[PDB]
Design a protein around this ligand. Sequence first.
Ligand SMILES: [Cl-]
Length: 177
Amino acid sequence: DHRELIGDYSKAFLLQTVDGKHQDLKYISPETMVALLTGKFSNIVDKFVIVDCRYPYEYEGGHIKTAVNLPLERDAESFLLKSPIAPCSLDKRVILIFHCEFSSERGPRMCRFIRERDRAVNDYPSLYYPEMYILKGGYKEFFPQHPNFCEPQDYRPMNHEAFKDELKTFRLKTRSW
Ligand SMILES: [Cl-]
């Protein structure tokens, strides 16, 4: 493999990646996200979690099948780290995919936060989630490519005109602004 090793330096990243804004993070395309959802790597990937970091009204307006909505740090930390999600075979991997609407701000920040906490609770260089990617372009670019891999089949943007109050109500729940 032509890249560096995953976070615990155990092995190479499994998936092909594409260039994204944060040059030190690993991004995948919608097609690679579908390869995980179709079991293309089922012999190796035991579990994968898609963490949709958008606000609840965005997720309810249309999200990728199987994704979990964890927009607040405290909730992403509890869900992912209180009782870590591990493969049922040591030969197999667990992979996290983070995304938001454009995968520009929200997704990358949550990914970095979970890596920080993962480092904090382990003895270096061990990690519960050594392999984490960002979905390039976020739900905004995934829906137009694979609508049948979404539920419900629609897209509600963060800045949607009818949800301005819901945006503010959510922001007042965050740990910091
Ligand atoms: Cl938060």
